[PDB]
Each structure stands twice: as C-alpha cells, then as structure tokens.
Design an enzyme around this catalytic site. Structure first.
Site, short mmCIF file in Angstrom:
data_model
loop_
_atom_site.label_atom_id
_atom_site.label_comp_id
_atom_site.label_asym_id
_atom_site.label_seq_id
_atom_site.Cartn_x
_atom_site.Cartn_y
_atom_site.Cartn_z
N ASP A 1 0.84 -1.19 0.00
CA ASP A 1 0.00 0.00 0.00
C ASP A 1 0.88 1.24 0.00
OD1 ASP A 1 0.93 -0.80 2.44
OD2 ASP A 1 -0.77 0.01 3.57
N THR B 1 -4.32 3.36 -2.03
CA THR B 1 -3.18 3.83 -1.26
C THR B 1 -2.04 4.31 -2.14
OG1 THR B 1 -2.47 1.53 -1.13
CG2 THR B 1 -3.72 2.41 0.73
N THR B 2 -2.00 3.84 -3.39
CA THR B 2 -0.96 4.21 -4.32
C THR B 2 -1.45 5.10 -5.46
OG1 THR B 2 0.24 2.16 -3.84
CG2 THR B 2 0.78 3.28 -5.89
N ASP C 1 -6.85 -2.03 6.38
CA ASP C 1 -7.33 -1.30 5.21
C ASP C 1 -8.69 -1.83 4.77
OD1 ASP C 1 -4.90 0.04 5.30
OD2 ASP C 1 -3.94 -1.35 3.89
#
Lengths: 522, 513, 534
Positions: free
Chosen positions: C55, C88-89, C392
């Site tokens: 992540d 997350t990226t 997450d």
C-alpha cells in the site's frame, strides 16, 4: 569474481531512453530563441577568455560540448547540416528534439521501435518528395530575374540572421561579388579583409584584389606609389643573398679567386635584377623575401617590390589579374606577365593595404568590411560566409521555398490531412509526427512574445482551404501570403533537414542500453 | 565631494532592485512566490509584508521598506505589494531630479507639496459609502481577497467575513473595531469546503469522561480555583501518630472532597470547567468518579486570559471560592457537542448560549498547513479591509483609474507650475504609471497600448471605466465590482511619501558594532 | 544591482519542471504497488530492517524527502490513507500525471488562471457526474458485497489467493462489533478489534475468536486457568502496597503503635481483597501491580488476577462483557463497597497456548458478541502485511456500510468518466474546454498502470472500453454498455459484478478532491527563493 572489470555500469530499457530524451530536450532548449529576424543573441566564454558570440545554431552547438550520446548525435548532425547547407541549423536541431519529446510518453505503454521507425522513414520519404514537387523556382533563366531572386534569397537568409537594414544592400553586393567569379566556384578565391573603424554600411567589394602590405626593410618610400597601367609579374623566387643550395662549398686558393667569386654572386643577383627590369613589369610579388639590395635597386629604378606574400593572396592574384606564377625568371615573356590599369598603396583605416585594380579579367574578389568590434565583424563575416554557402548551393538548382514558417505549416497540413487514411498505430504515430511539425512558426512568434496559439490557429484555418504560402510577419504580427514578401530559401535545405531528422529519430529510438567503461584513459 | 552622492545612488539602486524583486504579486492577478527558510519550513505567500519579512537581508533600505509595510498593514492591512513598488518608482523618478541639479532638501519639499495636492486628488476622487450596504462591503472584501490564492472559493469566504463584521460589533457607531473580538482556529487536514463558522466558541480539550459526550440545554459551570487535597498556600505536613489517625485522615479527605462535589451538584450545575494551574493543580480522579456517578462533564487545564471570551460567550463567571459560587451564575447553552475530524481529534463546540457574547470564532480546514496559513492571512487582511471601511466611509474603484488620474492631474499641475518644482511635479506625474504598467504586464498584455488607452481615458475626464482583466483592456469597473476603500489608498500614499521623504533626506550610512 | 536576497532564485519553468521532476521521481517508484496485479516492493531500513509493503502510504512514509512539493505529496498520500485507506498508491500517480499535463500546457504559453479555474470546475463537474450517472444498488447484495470489497482490498496484498475464508472471517468480525450511533444508523468502533498476531504455521492456521484475547497471561500457575463461570471485576486502582499520601510523615514517641502501623500497610489492601473476594470473584483485572500478598490471597481463593492491564482494551472488554470500570469502591458517598450487580458476563477464561506461548482468552461475552483476530503466519513481516491489509479492508467496509453506495471499478469508473468528460466539455467552448479535455485524457493513467502491471495490450482494451462507453453515452438506446469495466484477471471487458470488484463512491470523490486541490495549489506556484541555510 566480477564478470566484468570493476568500475563499469549500465542503464537499460525505458529509463535509459527516457534519460536520453531528457538530454535531447535540455540541449535543444539552449538555442530556443536564436533563429528569426528578431533573434536574441547568446555568448560563451572559454578558459582563454576568447569569448565568442553568435546566433547561428550550428556554430553555437560546436561552441558547447556534451558527453551524452544523444546530444553528441545532435551536435554532429548540426555539423553535418552546416557543412551541407549552413542555414536553419537551429530549425533542424529543434525539430528533431520535439519529435523525440512528442514520442517520449509513447514508450511507457505498448509500442516498439519497429513501427515508429517505419513511420518516421516513410513520412520523411513522402515529405521529401513533397519538397521536390512543390518547391518554387524562377523557371525564367534570364539574368535579371536570376540576380533578383539571388538577392531575395540572400535577404531571406538575413531574414533570420543579425543585420536587417542592409539586406538588399549586402545581397546585391554578394551577388555581384560571386558574378565576378568563374563556374568553378572555388572557395579559396574570396578575399576577406576585416577593417577596424568605418561604418557597417561602408563594407565594400574590391573588383580587383587588395591585400595587406607585409613588413619591408629600409629603402622603401622612394618607390612610386602610383601607376596608370602597370604590368605584374607573379614570382615564387628569392631575391636575397643566399647560398646556392644550402650545401654548396667553395674551395679556392688566392685572394683573386675569392674576389671573383663574391663579385660573381653579386653578378648573379644583378643579372636576375636585369632580367626582371628589362622584362618590363612594374611590380613583383612572391612568397619569398626580397633582399634590401633588390629593394634599393627597384627604388633607384622606380619599381615596386614585395615578398613574403601568403599563397592564397598570390592565388587570387593569378586568378583575377591574368598572369602566371613564376618560380624562374629566365623565360619571362609577355604571356606570363600580368597587367592592370591601377596600382596604389591606399590607406583604409590606419592600415597599409596594397590595391591592384583595373584588371579586365576578374575571377576573385576581396571583401573590405568596416566596423568597430572584432567579434561583431566576425559575426557579420560569419553571416557573409553563410550567405555565400546558401547562394553557392542554390546557384546550381534555382528552386526555392518561402520562409517565414509558411512551408512548414503547408507540410504539417499535408501530413495531417493525409494521416487519416493510414491505419492504426502507424496513423497515430504519424499524427504525432505531424503535430510535432507545428512549432517553428510558433517558436518564431514566442521569440517575439506573441500569442503563438492564436496565430497558428488562424494560419491553419487559412491554410486548410483558403490558399497557401501564408507566413507570419513580425513587424505586422499578422498572417498573409508572405511568399510575395519574397522571404524565399532553397528546398534542398528542406530535404537535408528531413534526412537528418529521420536519421536522428530512428537512431535514438533504436537506443536500448549502454555500457560505460571506467575510462582509465584520461 | 561626490562619494556621498555615490552612496545615495547605491542606496536608491538597492531599494529599486529589492522592490523589483516582488513585481509579480500585485492586485487581482498577482502570483505567489515560494520562500524556503533555512529552517525546516516553507511558506507559500502573496501578502507583501509577509514576503518582505521572510527575507532576513542585511541592507538597510529593504528593512525600511519592511517596516513601512508593517506600518501599512497596521493601518490598512491589504496588498502591501503595491507600496514597495510605489516607493521604488518614486526613487527612480527622483534619480532624474538628482542628476538634474535639484538639491535633496528641495526634492523633499517637492514631495511635500506633491503629497499636499495628491491628498485632495484622492479625496475628490472618492465617494462616500453606506454602512450595512451588503454589496459595497462584499465587493470591497472580495476584491481584497482577489490579491490572494484562495480566490477559487471567494463565494464562500466572503459571506463569512461579512457575517463576522455584523455579529462582532454594532453598526451604529464605533469609528474602529477590536480585532481580538474575532477569533480563528487553524487545523491541519480537512478541506477548504469544511471551513465554517459558529457564533459561539470552540474548546480544545476533550471531556475526561466518555459516558456523556454531548449534552443539551446544560447549565454550564466554570471553576478556576484549586480542587486538590486540602493544602495550604504555605508549607505544612499532617503528622499521623497511629492507625486511627490514618483512618480519620482517609475518611475526612473523602468527606471534604465529596462535600465540595455535593456543593457544586446542589448548585444545579451540569458541565464543569477547570482552568490550568501548576503547583498543586485543580483536578482529582475522585472528582471524575463522583461526576460520572452524577452524570457531569468536565474540561480541565484552560488558559488564563481566555476567561473573558468564555464568560462573555456563555455567561458563566469565574469564582475562586465555593462560597461565591452561585446557581444564577450558570451560563446556559443549548447544545454542547463533541465533533470528530475523521480521525483528526475531537473538539468541543459551545452552541445556543443564552448570554450575549460579543466574540465569534471560525474554523478553517485544508489539505495541508500552508494553504490554511495563506487563507488565514487573507481573511485577516480582509478583516483589516473592513475595519478601515467602518473606520471612515469612502471608497475608490480599481482598474488602474486612481494612479493614472493622479498622474495626469499632476502632469496638468506641472503644466501650471514653474520654477525648479515644475519638473519635479512632472516626475511625480510620470511616477504613478508604474502600477498600471505592472497590472497590464502581469495580465499578459502589451503595456504600452492599454496604459496609453487608460491615460487617454482619464484625459477625457470620464471614469468608472478602467483596467479590466476579464475584458482584456480598459473598460467599466463598477460592473467588475472592483472597489477598494479611499482609506487604504490614502494610507498607502501618505506612508510611502513620508518614507521617501525620510529616504531623500537620508544619504549617509556608517557601519557600527 | 544584485538582489539583496543573499539566497538562490530560480525562475522560469525550471522549478516548475523540477516539481514535475519531483512529481516524476517518486511516482513511478511507487507505481508498481496497486491493482490486482501490483507486485511487492522491498525496503531495507538503514538499520537492517527489511520490510514488505504494497500500500502506497506505508511505502512512502519511511522515505526521506527534501524537495518541498514532494513532501506535500507525501502528506497527501498519508492523509489519503488516514481518512480513506484505499487507493493507497493511485492518488500520487494521478496527481503526478496531472502536474505533467499542466506544466506542459503552461509551457505552451497559456494563462495559469484559466487552467486553474478549469481544474476547480472540472473537479466539481467530475464529482457531480460520479454522483448522478453511475447510481446502482447495494441492497441487491449484503454479507457478500463485503466479501467482494475485501477481495478488492487484498487484490494487491499477500493473501489475495485465500480470500474465501478470510473475507467471511472479516465480515463476521464487522458484524460482531456493529454498534449504533444516532439510534437510527449503524456505528463502528474502529481500532476496537485487536488483531494480535503470531509467527504461526500458515495463513490458513489463523483463527477468529468470538470473544476476546488479551496480550496478557495468567500471573502464576497457582491460579486455576479455566474458571467455570465468569463474573469479571475490572479495576483501574493500583493494587500495590498501599501508600497513604505523599505529604505525611510519622512522628511516634509511643512505640506500641509502631509495629501495628506495619500491620496497616497490609490490612487495607487485605481488607479490600476480602471485600473483593467476598462477592465470589472469578477474575481480577488491574492496571496496578500485584504483589506476593495479593498473589497468595488469590491463589487461596482461586481467582485470576492480572497486573499491568492496559486501559483502552480494558474499557473494550468491560463494555463487551457488560463489566464496569472501577477505580475505587466508594459509592455515591464515602461508603467504599463492592457491588455484585455489575460483574462482567462471560462463559470462561483460559490461558490457551497458540504456538509455544500462552495468553488470556475470553469466551463469549454475554448478551452480545465481540471481534478479535489471531493472525498466525509463517513469520513476522508477512503477518504484519496481513495486519495492514485487514486494517485497510475494515476501513473500506466501514466506509461502505456507513454510506451504502458502491460502483464497479477496474477502470470502469475511469473509462466512463473520461468518456463523459471528453464528450462533455462543450459547455464553455473556450480556453477552458481544452482544460476539460486534458482532464478526460489524464485519467488514462489508471488503465495504463494496471495494464503495465498486468502486461496487457493497453490500447486495445482502452479503445474497447472507451468505444462502449461512448456509444452508451451519445446513444443511450443501449445504455447497458455503461455497466462494463476492465478486469485484469484475463484482460476482459466485463460487468464488474461477477468478480464483485466494487469501490465506494466517496473514495473516488475524496481522492479526486484532494488531487485537484494539490494540483491547483502547485499551479499557482511560479517562483522560488532558496534562502541561505542557518
């Protein structure tokens, strides 16, 4: 054990080519404003303090050095274009650079060098054929129109170079200067004398040949500095007291023999003098030094002598005057002798230049240009050289194309409207090619700080279905058929531009990886 | 002697260079500039005074300009980017006076008379303004904001600013407003959209109990004195001589504590408030246990000088002793609720207070700390705009009109003036063209065309039609709603001219320890 | 003359490009870490701490960045994690390419104001269109859409292969702590399900507990380790050797009392112990220490007593079992008594051994249920990877359940929004229309990054999806094509419902808002002064 010798490294794949494209853009932007009539000039300084100032892009690229492969390719291509054409080098380096820039993002997704190289090569071929087919020409063969368009192309060359107030003035000057030359078009028969002081407008064209008076010993200033029809003898012989062949030895036994030998040397000297004088020539020139005895004799005999003349000077002397170079005097006759109606040692800006005019034959010229800076005179001389190159190429093939960005937009439009039939990724990449083909007029506009976007939009609209040959004026800041403004340049420049551009594109896109030696050879 | 004159020229050049350094940040279409400090911070900035401050330069002239900008912000507050440009332009103009044989005292007197005339020039130029007239104040503050970076949400940052000036003070008559009445909070995280206002105030600490975390119609209580175990202000020690004394000490400590808590509970209190202290502080765990047994909130360790804000807002008043603590002195707010910031802390907003509060607070959120810093400075300068607006009521529209009008009328005065002062007046006249030139320039325009167009427009004598960044040239300004107070311009001009008179007098610099 | 800045000023597009350069350098560095085909990135800390992470936020947080705008993007990624926790990226990549487009556009000499206003308006229109023109129902699903959300979470994670057990586990865990906030809507106590881990035997050897497991163990083997019925006594009072008050000194001239005072030191504690032990106490939980006196007494009583008990976990367990927080035995007045009406309710408590070590475990807190997961893995790093993955996933599912709205993904939303906005953008026809066009174009990176991480022919699939969405939009007669997205399982345009690939709309909305915010923030930055360092 390390597979290769210690100290090496290598980058590969997408990162390597991305770094190369970045280097290409970095080196490209360094000349972003030079070309154009409103061009804005650059300077460089070396460790010797010999600062050099120029706006011709190729020379600029030589003034700079890199170690990157792609940038070295760019600068060598600039060398090639300058040796080939000598104008628009800025244009070719820039254009290849934005092609590479426009193609950069395409590497991050599915695409291979094969298709892009094929598209580049085929587009270059088709556009070169277009260059050939629609290049404008006099097609008149009459000397008045020929001369007129030579001068028009000269001012076109100056339509992006430094001076802009002497365009027709210097154009007619250089056109005449070359029309007093033969069909050989030798690049050694163009004398250049940069003169301190004097206005830029005072640059002139010597019909005969002038040069610099080299150092002379005593006994001068008695020679007649004026003749109304002298005859010229072109020598390469020494008039100085010299041993025979530098190895001769003398073996005598009494003082009488000694005196006889020395008087005999004097007799050799004076017999050469007699041959020269009785030959009838009024001036003598040579590479070889003239002994003071000969100078005193000629002053006593009211004759001009000069030696240590550089070869090219003498070459121009033969080529214009109509004489013949001599290494010997024993067979001096009328056919060898040159002839002119004017000789004078005039003064041009604190100097002593020997002037020889009145020669009915004239196949070489010596420019006499006036100014106040060695560097600015050098830049003007460089532009003169560029004009010489452009006309010398164009004088063969009297077919040209209009400058001012009209032709570039013509070719961009042609590629765009044709790039709707071609298939697939080839079509997309060719469209990228065409889009990259739309910068040089934009760069001209932004060089003058103009809204290039609007200008390109309007000129594209006018080019689409409302006529061709529409260029951008800068004093008017508008679009119109500026071909009739007579800013016309040769088309072999365009063909060579495309050749080099395709070469560079296919080269750098063929880059995949490089290994770097530890370069211990420093 | 000439070296003093060379020093003077050097100082003028330094001032001009420093002024030119910030020539892309003025007015509606200015641009921001990074200032990265040697420390581990960074500041995006547009307000001129701030920018001038972060340069820790060593040259006196720029420091003078910095202090001038400080003074102007104290007086007016907005867009001090201009005053430096004006000062530098006047210095460049008076360079020409100096080269033309005009004695520095004479130059200073010429500035004095030019100031005299320009005061009236601006005065007759302006027109009075109506208080409580929403549109005029709105346009003034919004155009003030247009010189900053948060202009994309001006439709949101204008009504909050205007509501501030209605709800802080009365519009009847004040001639000035206390800014410390207005309160703001800055918080890392959130968004510009999350920014809002409450007519009450917000408290930072979170209630020491989770059993009750949102109380409605509470009778709020504030306490400032010590709550800890019985201890004298002066030293002592309670000596125990056997187990029985220990038992009595324990029982009586409990009894005293519960007696106090029962006193406060009997007073009808609902929520407790404890100030901050050192050296035998004012909270005990047993107090929390008691309050939970009787369903009471508490907030501890609050600041000293904030007492006025809280007391005025809620109505509860401070007591240092239980005996003076009374039930009538309870501030009654409709709702005391704790809010979440999506994992970014818990606050306490006090709402629906029954007592008349004369202070307000507003919250700001954003994706980082620099955006909220810039928004805070912009809102502060807008509040300064309104404080000057209510200070005295006169307006002047922008569009380049004021400076070009003053320039042309000083040109006419020079035409009507003789002697050495005539050309100085001409120099003044030519000086006020720098600001419109910059405005046209950074607007991406050809400065000659538009500036000459406005010069001719003010030669016609007709006005309300000036520089337009939406039309792209010289056009109407009233529809553009581009207005600034006459006071900001008057203050700017007066401060600048006094500073430059000091400048012209000053010509000698000597280094000391 | 020379500027008195004393620092270093760079002008032109250079610093702009440099921001671009910054926005370039980090972006692709983290590029390989999101989507169902995102591969792991290994990070070695300077102290030899090798780490597994996928992540984006965890990836970036330990990088040391000195370039300012890159730092700004760093905390942008951190906030994207701290509120949303998914994508997350993606966000840094989206912002990076947006900056690329913007800086190139300004290099073509356009006023920054037009493009900045375009950025703001385009963000607003994009969020709007997401709101209206992709409404679907999640009430057609439930207890299974959560499974699919967990699947999409693990897509790039380490356990994407064994989701059948784990997703059911996590959905039941969510159901086990489902609370209500406003009495009409649900509420979830985030970070109230402790996920305590172990270097176990395998991922399949982790078990979920319908109860609670501390990080705590029985104090001594003298106590019984399985109490038959659990009446729990939670404490905060420190059970150490009692100290009366820090401000008392003894003065004794009659030594007879002296020894008896030594007695008192125990008695009080002892006395409360009897009180504590009067109610048939089963388990004793205290944060304060437990000494030999209490140890012996509790052994004699057979009631568990554990010291150094934490606080938040104690509150959780007291609420779960119905127990109450105690810091003293005092009632509404000075009467200090223990009450048997609030003892915690549970079945039994055991010091179970998992791999080689024991721990306290609670069975079935009465009247309700509770959630806690024992993560057993082959080692510590991958078990931490599941830790982050499940955190997450719980963030995603709590976002889903708070606002019961979701749309399919895998570029479905990306391609649909691009098609709309490109076929849209005629509402201005001005210098901002090209801006909206570049917005429609710039979302091409998400299919690009997914394809490169999957080695798919990006152009063919993106053309297919774009054509389907274009014909659906401009020709709403066959609007079914708007229900299609791209799946990287076999590079297929599919109804992204059978795979279950589904993401909350608020996630895309929020990421887009912050992305455009930072983009505008940077696009109103033009010059930099590098002041001299201290």
């Amino acid at each position: 054990v390390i597979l290769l010798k210690e100290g090496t490294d290598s980058s590969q794949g997408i990162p390597q080519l991305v770094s190369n494209i970045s280097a290409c853009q970095v080196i490209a932007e360094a000349v972003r404003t030079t070309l154009g009539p409103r061009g804005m000039d650059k300077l460089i300084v070396d460790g010797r303090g010999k600062a050099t100032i120029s706006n011709d892009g190729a020379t600029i690229l030589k003034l700079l050095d890199v170690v990157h492969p792609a940038a070295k390719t760019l600068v060598d291509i600039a060398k090639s274009q300058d040796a080939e054409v000598g104008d628009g080098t800025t244009s070719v380096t820039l254009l290849a650079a934005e092609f590479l820039k426009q193609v950069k993002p395409y590497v991050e997704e599915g695409l291979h060098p094969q298709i892009i190289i094929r598209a580049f090569r085929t587009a270059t071929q088709l556009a070169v054929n277009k260059i050939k087919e629609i290049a404008v020409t006099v097609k008149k063969a009459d000397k008045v129109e020929q001369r007129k368009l030579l001068e028009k192309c000269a001012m076109t060359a100056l339509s992006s170079k430094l001076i802009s107030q002497q365009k027709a003035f210097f154009a007619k000057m250089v056109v005449d200067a070359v029309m007093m030359l033969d069909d050989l078009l030798q690049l050694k028969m163009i004398g250049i004398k940069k003169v301190q002081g004097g206005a830029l407008e005072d640059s002139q064209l010597v019909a005969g040949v002038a040069f610099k008076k080299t150092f002379s010993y005593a006994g001068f200033e008695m020679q007649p500095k004026k003749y109304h029809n002298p005859k010229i003898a072109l020598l390469n012989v020494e008039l100085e007291l010299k041993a025979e062949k530098d190895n001769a030895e003398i073996r005598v036994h009494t003082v009488e023999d000694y005196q006889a030998i020395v008087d005999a040397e004097w007799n050799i000297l004076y017999d050469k003098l007699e041959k020269i004088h009785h030959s009838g020539a009024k001036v003598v020139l040579s590479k070889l030094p003239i002994g003071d005895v000969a100078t005193q004799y000629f002053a006593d005999r009211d004759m001009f002598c000069a030696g240590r003349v550089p070869e090219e000077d003498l070459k121009r002397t033969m080529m214009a005057c109509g004489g013949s170079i001599q290494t010997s005097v024993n067979a001096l006759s009328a056919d060898v002798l040159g002839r002119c109606q004017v000789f004078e040692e005039t003064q041009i800006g604190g100097e002593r230049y020997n002037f020889f005019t009145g020669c009915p034959k004239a196949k070489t010229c010596t420019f006499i240009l006036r100014g106040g800076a060695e560097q600015f005179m050098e830049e003007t001389e460089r532009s003169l050289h560029d004009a010489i190159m452009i006309v010398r190429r164009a004088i063969k093939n009297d077919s040209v194309v209009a400058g001012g960005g009209a032709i570039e937009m013509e070719l961009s439009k042609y590629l765009r409207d044709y790039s709707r039939t071609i298939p697939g990724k080839q079509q997309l990449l060719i469209g990228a090619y065409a889009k990259a083909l739309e910068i040089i007029p934009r760069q001209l506009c932004d060089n003058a700080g103009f809204d290039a976007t609007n200008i390109l939009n309007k000129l594209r609209a006018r080019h689409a279905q409302g006529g061709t040959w529409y260029g951008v004026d800068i004093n008017n800041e508008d679009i119109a058929d500026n071909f009739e403004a007579f800013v016309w340049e040769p088309a072999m420049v365009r063909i060579n531009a495309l050749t080099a551009a395709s070469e560079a594109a296919c080269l750098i896109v063929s880059v995949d990886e490089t290994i770097k030696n530890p370069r211990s050879t420093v | 002697r000439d070296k003093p004159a060379q020093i003077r020229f050097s100082n003028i050049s330094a001032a001009k260079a420093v002024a030119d350094a910030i020539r892309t940040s003025l007015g509606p279409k200015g641009m921001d500039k990074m200032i990265q400090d040697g420390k581990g911070d960074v500041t995006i900035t547009n307000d001129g005074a701030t920018i001038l401050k972060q340069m820790q330069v060593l040259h006196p002239a720029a420091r003078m300009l910095v202090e001038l900008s400080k003074a102007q912000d104290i007086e007016a507050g907005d867009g001090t980017t201009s005053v430096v440009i004006i000062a530098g332009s006047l210095l460049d103009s008076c360079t020409k006076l100096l080269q033309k044989g005009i004695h520095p005292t004479i130059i200073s007197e010429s500035f004095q008379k030019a100031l005299e005339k320009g005061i009236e020039i601006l005065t007759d130029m302006s027109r009075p303004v109506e208080l409580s007239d929403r549109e005029t104040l709105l346009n003034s503050a919004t155009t003030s904001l247009n010189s900053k970076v948060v202009s994309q949400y001006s439709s949101l940052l204008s009504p909050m600013s205007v509501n501030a000036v209605m709800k802080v003070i009365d519009p009847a008559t004040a001639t000035s407003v206390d800014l410390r009445d207005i309160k703001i909070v800055k918080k890392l995280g959130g968004t510009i959209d999350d920014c809002e206002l409450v007519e009450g105030l917000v408290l930072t600490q979170k209630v020491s109990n989770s059993g009750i975390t949102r109380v409605e119609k509470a009778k709020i209580g504030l306490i400032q004195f010590c709550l800890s175990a019985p201890k004298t202000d002066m030293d002592n020690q309670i000596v125990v001589s056997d187990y029985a004394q220990m038992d009595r000490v324990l029982r009586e400590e409990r009894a005293y504590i519960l007696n106090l808590v029962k006193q406060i509970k009997k007073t009808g209190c609902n929520v407790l408030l404890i100030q901050k202290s050192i050296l035998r502080d004012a909270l005990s765990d047993l107090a929390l246990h008691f309050l939970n047994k009787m369903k009471i909130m508490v907030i501890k360790d609050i600041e000293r000088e904030d007492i006025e804000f809280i007391c005025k807002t809620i109505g509860t008043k401070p007591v240092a002793h239980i005996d003076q603590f009374t039930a009538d002195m309870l501030g009654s707010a409709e709702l005391a609720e704790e809010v979440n910031l999506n994992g970014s802390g818990k606050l306490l907003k006090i709402t629906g207070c029954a007592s008349p509060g004369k202070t307000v607070t507003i919250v700001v959120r954003g994706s980082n700390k620099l955006v909220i810093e810039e928004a805070e400075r912009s809102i502060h300068d807008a509040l300064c705009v309104i404080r000057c607006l209510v200070k005295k009521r006169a307006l002047i529209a922008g569009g380049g009109a004021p400076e070009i009008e003053l320039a042309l009328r000083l040109t006419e005065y020079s035409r009507t003036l003789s002697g050495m002062e005539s050309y100085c007046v001409r120099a003044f006249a030519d000086a006020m063209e720098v600001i419109p030139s910059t405005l046209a320039e950074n607007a991406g325009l050809n400065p000659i065309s538009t500036v000459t167009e406005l010069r001719n427009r003010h030669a016609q004598g007709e006005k309300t039609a000036g520089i337009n960044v939406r039309k792209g040239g010289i056009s109407n300004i009233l529809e553009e709603l581009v207005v600034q107070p006459l006071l900001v311009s008057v203050s700017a001009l007066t401060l600048a001219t006094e500073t430059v008179r000091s400048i012209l007098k000053i010509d000698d610099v000597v280094n000391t320890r | 003359g020379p500027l008195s800045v004393f620092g270093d000023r760079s002008t032109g597009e250079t610093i702009r490009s440099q921001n671009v350069m910054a926005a370039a350098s980090i972006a692709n560095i983290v590029k390989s870490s999101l989507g169902p085909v995102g591969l792991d990135k290994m990070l070695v800390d300077d102290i030899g701490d090798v780490t597994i992470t996928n992540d984006g936020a965890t990836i970036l947080k330990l990088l040391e960045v000195e370039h300012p705008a890159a730092k700004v993007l760093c905390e942008l990624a951190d906030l994207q994690d701290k509120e949303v926790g998914d994508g997350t990226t993606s966000v840094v990549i989206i912002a990076a390419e947006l900056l690329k487009n913007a800086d190139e556009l300004v290099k073509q000499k356009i006023h920054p104001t037009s493009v900045i206003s375009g950025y703001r308006l385009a963000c607003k229109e994009a969020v709007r269109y997401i709101n209206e023109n992709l409404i679907v129902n999640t009430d057609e699903l439930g207890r299974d859409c959560l499974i699919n959300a967990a699947k999409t979470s693990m897509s790039s994670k380490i356990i994407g292969i064994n989701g059948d057990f784990f997703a059911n586990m996590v959905v039941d865990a969510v159901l086990a702590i489902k609370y209500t906030d406003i009495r009409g809507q649900p509420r979830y106590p985030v970070n109230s399900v402790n996920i305590l881990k172990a270097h176990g035997r395998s991922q399949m050897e982790s078990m979920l507990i319908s109860g609670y497991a501390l990080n705590c163990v029985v104090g001594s083997q003298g106590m019984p380790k399985r109490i038959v019925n659990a009446k729990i006594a939670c404490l905060d009072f420190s059970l150490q050797k009692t100290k009366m008050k820090l401000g008392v000194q003894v003065v004794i001239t009659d030594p007879e009392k002296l020894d008896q005072i030594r007695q008192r030191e125990s008695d009080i504690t002892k006395e409360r112990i009897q009180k504590i032990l009067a109610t048939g106490a089963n388990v004793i939980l205290t944060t304060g220490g437990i000494d030999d006196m209490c140890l012996k007494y509790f052994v004699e009583a057979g009631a568990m007593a554990v010291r150094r008990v934490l606080k938040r976990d104690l509150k959780r367990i007291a609420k779960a079992s119905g127990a109450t927080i105690l810091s003293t035995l005092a009632n509404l007045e000075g009467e200090e008594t223990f009450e048997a009406a609030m003892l915690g309710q549970a079945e039994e408590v055991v010091q179970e051994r998992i791999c080689d070590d024991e721990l306290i475990l609670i069975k079935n807190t009465k009247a309700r249920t509770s959630a806690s997961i024992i993560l057993r893995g082959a080692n510590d790093f991958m078990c931490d990877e599941m830790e982050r993955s499940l955190h997450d996933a719980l963030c995603v599912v709590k976002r889903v359940l708070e606002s019961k709205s979701v749309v399919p993904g895998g570029g479905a939303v990306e391609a649909a929004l691009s098609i709309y906005l490109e076929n849209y953008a005629t509402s201005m026809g001005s210098r901002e229309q090209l801006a909206i066009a570049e917005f429609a174009r710039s979302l091409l990176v998400i299919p690009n990054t997914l394809a490169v991480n999957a080695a798919q022919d990006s152009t063919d699939l993106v053309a297919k999806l774009r054509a389907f969405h274009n014909e659906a939009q401009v020709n709403p007669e066959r609007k079914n094509l708007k229900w299609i997205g791209l799946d990287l399982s076999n590079g297929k345009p599919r109804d992204n419902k059978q795979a279950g690939v589904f993401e909350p709309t608020i996630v895309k909305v929020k990421s887009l808002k912050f992305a455009t915010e930072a983009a505008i923030t940077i696009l109103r930055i033009d010059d930099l002064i590098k002041l001299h360092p201290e």
